[PDB]
């Protein structure tokens, strides 16, 4: 089976997310998960590119599945207008021990914040411009280098 | 008549709520939003719930005193993180939820570290107890990554 990957503008149930990972993985138990959210400093408003966006989290998603054989991995990144406190992004995976699971979830979620295909607003008489992280050491420690 | 507050770290023998106490501890870090989780469950290896697969009991004070110096240790390498951590005791089913640790930071790569230096140090330090027929052993374990 192949790991699970959504766009969505409703907002996701992080504990239904983990349940349905762990269905399908009923002889591992260590499950990491992240969940982001809109820090409330003194709005986001975020979009994706259909299609292309799905196929690269689908793809960061199968290379942790190389690096760490045997783990499963959910992804649930949400679109649109997003307020403060609000949930972004989740991202869970479960392993056989602890230690992939949270090497591959923290390695899925550094590649999507560098890679994964979305746009923010900015508004400047308003525009769209790239949200990926200009960090071009991140993916250092993942072997990535550039 | 005054009601005594629950701890954000305990031992229970009662099932938690994973997206309950990821939501608790948002509410009491009104000002950062990156949520580390860590959820460990009993594995399902087909032997059924007739017996307990895993049957724990703790040191009661002593046990959660030390949860509380793990998880004020964490606070002081990643400043500005908190922590929560629910570990469960008595008989436990395959698929049955053993233990949670959740952190919370600015942001993701301190909201990882200290989660994981969290279940490092309870799987090593945390008095805990194990049945194992019958007699209980120590439950307690390579931390050279910290």
């Known amino acids: 089976h192949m790991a699970t990957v959504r766009v ?6 992080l504990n239904a997310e983990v349940a349905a990972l762990r269905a399908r993985n009923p002889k591992i138990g260590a499950v990491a998960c992240f969940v982001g959210t809109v820090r409330d400093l003194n709005a986001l408003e975020l979009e994706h590119y259909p299609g292309m966006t799905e196929k690269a989290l689908e793809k960061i998603a199968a290379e942790a599945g190389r690096r760490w054989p045997g783990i499963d991995v959910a ?3 949400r679109v649109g207008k997003l307020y403060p406190l609000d949930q972004i992004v989740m991202v869970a995976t479960v392993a056989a021990h602890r230690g992939d699971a949270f090497a591959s979830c923290e390695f899925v979620m550094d590649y999507l914040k560098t890679d994964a295909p979305f746009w923010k607003k900015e508004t400047t008489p308003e525009r769209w411009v790239d949200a990926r992280s200009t960090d071009d050491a991140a993916l250092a420690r993942w072997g990535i280098e550039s």
């Open 8 to 13: 969505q503008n409703d907002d996701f149930d």
């Open 75 to 77: 992804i649930v990144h």
